[PDB]
């Protein structure tokens, strides 16, 4: 077999080029202002006095923070990034085929794995030994051939993240689930609805009547001294989020460690 050295096709197949990690953008995952507007089809958000519509800058800002919120809500890495870890030796797990759990998951690929001493490589494991489980975040060695722990003996470099899915409705373990995108959308949408709920009427207006020269107009609104103008929609979005998070925290497992 011949391959680019670290990426042995069984244990550590290459899934991304280290140049592509710079080229991916939020819009490649479908997170775009237009997608939000699509979920607010038939609404436009505009400054009541100035008339100017809200710019896409705020949309992209909200989306970047929604991705951050999603990445902490599930213990996951979404956008590809290079991770460099120094990991502790523990005797129990070192005997267990050099088991290490990565801090960030999924693994797109492992880039380096070494046993070291003051930065000096004591041993570099042949890449044909590396066993990677991508979605779990697990790395092991299966060699072909005075204390129970010690700090930072193991040096591990890898790329964590997800790729955009290549087929409709389907994802590989290194590909983004179709509805984690929708979860990030919902998170953005909830902030955009909080903004919009101020602007349907003049600030703080919850009822109006005008009568002039035999013409009368009267409007009641979804705002009130209790509920903001988008309370209902926010509640619904929160319900949908709850269902989505249940499903995704079933897809990713429970975290565990042995002491």
């Amino acid at each position: 077999l011949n391959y680019e050295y670290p990426y042995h096709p069984s244990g550590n197949p290459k899934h991304i080029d280290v140049s592509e990690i710079d080229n991916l953008t939020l819009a490649d995952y479908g997170w775009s202002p237009d997608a939000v507007k699509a979920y607010m089809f038939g609404i436009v958000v505009q400054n009541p006095d100035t008339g100017q519509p809200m710019g896409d800058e705020f949309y992209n800002h909200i989306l970047e923070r929604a991705v951050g919120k999603a990445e902490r809500a599930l213990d996951i890495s979404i956008l590809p990034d290079t991770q460099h870890e120094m990991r502790d030796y523990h005797e129990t797990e070192f005997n267990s085929y050099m088991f290490v759990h990565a801090y960030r998951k999924p693994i797109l690929q492992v880039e380096n794995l070494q046993l070291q001493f003051n930065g000096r490589p004591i041993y570099k494991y042949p890449a044909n030994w590396w066993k990677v489980e991508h979605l779990a975040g697990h790395v092991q060695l299966f060699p072909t051939a005075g204390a129970t722990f010690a700090p930072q003996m193991i040096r591990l470099e890898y790329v964590s993240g997800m790729l955009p899915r290549k087929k409709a409705g389907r994802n590989k373990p290194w590909e983004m689930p179709p509805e984690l995108e929708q979860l990030v959308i919902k998170y953005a949408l909830k902030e955009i609805y909080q903004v919009w709920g101020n602007l349907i009427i003049g600030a703080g207006i919850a009822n109006k009547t005008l009568e002039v020269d035999g013409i009368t107009e009267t409007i009641g609104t979804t705002q009130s001294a209790m509920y903001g103008g988008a309370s209902a929609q926010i509640l619904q979005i929160n319900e949908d989020i709850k269902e989505l998070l249940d499903g995704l925290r079933a897809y990713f497992g429970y975290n565990m460690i042995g002491l």
Binding site: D246, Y251, G253
Partner: protein, 56 residues
């Protein structure tokens, strides 16, 4: 020869059952951390909503 010797069931419960993949890599974390003499005196920490063991 034929019996179930199984001591009991470890019930872990949450809003929905884990996928089989999640459960199998949880089995891998378990055996890699706790099995045999090598794991013999370590205790797992688990943060499920509730955990129960039924003695059979």
């Amino acid at each position: 020869s034929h019996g179930g010797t199984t001591r009991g069931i470890l019930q872990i419960r949450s809003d929905q059952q884990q996928s089989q993949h999640a459960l199998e890599n949880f089995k891998r974390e378990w055996k890699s951390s706790l099995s045999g003499i090598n794991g013999s005196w370590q205790i797992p920490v688990v943060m499920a909503d509730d955990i129960k063991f039924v003695n059979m």
